[PDB]
Amino acid sequence: KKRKKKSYTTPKKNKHKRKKVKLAVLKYYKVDENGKISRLRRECPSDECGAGVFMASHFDRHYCGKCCLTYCFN
Amino acid sequence: GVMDVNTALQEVLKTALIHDGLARGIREAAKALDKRQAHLCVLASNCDEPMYVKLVEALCAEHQINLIKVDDNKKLGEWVGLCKIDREGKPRKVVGCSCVVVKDYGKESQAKDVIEEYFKC
């Protein structure tokens, strides 16, 4: 109906926003003294998802699609 | 009634905006090249250092793409028309796209075709 004095908790809570990206540089490294392409694409056997979808960089992890495929080196 | 490469460039840019396209930002832009959905590469003009344009040239050539030239990227950013703020703002486009066929499949245009044939062979 009105303000119930809720303005002191979560002081103008911010909408979820992790990072603000202009350009990707560290993910693009095709320097092998020749200029050839270097990629790390990995995909699950299916039709909806292929090599086109991007990958989350990790020390050991392969985030691919929505199927939640888990394939670790143990 | 003259035929010119730049006259066809304006038409292809506007119809690429009309038919799908509109790839703003390097994100969701390499996916079209990986799936080979896109068919054009855009090169920003008067960059600070030439490694940016050289890398764009490299990724264009290695993907078997004709080296289509774009000049005055700020004007290329005005040519889209989605600037708003009357004429202020002036947002450019990092890369081009040619999905859902640039022209009509029933009736294709020769303004694009002449450039395509001249650059390919």
Write down the domain spans for chain B: 5-121
Beta-carbon neighbour count of residue B44 at 10 Å? 18
Rounded CA-CA distance A3/B117 in Å is 68
What is the Cβ-side half-sphere exposure of residue B102, based on CA atoms within 13 angstroms?
23
In chain B, what residues touch A54 (CB-CB under 8 Å)? 30-31
Cα–Cα distance list, B105 to B101, B102, B109 (Å):
7, 9, 9
Nearest to A24 among B26, B58, B62 (CB): B26
Within an 8 Å CB–CB cutoff, is residue A11 touching chain B? no
Q: Residue B117 has which token pair?
A: 């044939």
Cα angle B10, B22, B38; round to 5:
85
Per DSSP, the three-state class of A23 is: coil
Q: How far is CA B17 from CA B13, B67, B80, B100, in A?
A: 6, 20, 7, 11
Residues from chain A that touch B58, judged by Cβ atoms under 8 A, are 30, 35
In CATH, what is the architecture of B5-121?
2-Layer Sandwich (3.30)
B95 CB contacts (<8 Å, ≥6 apart)?
Answer: B23, B26, B29, B32, B33, B38, B40, B41, B42
Resolution (A): 2.7
B58 touches A: beta carbon within 8 Å: yes
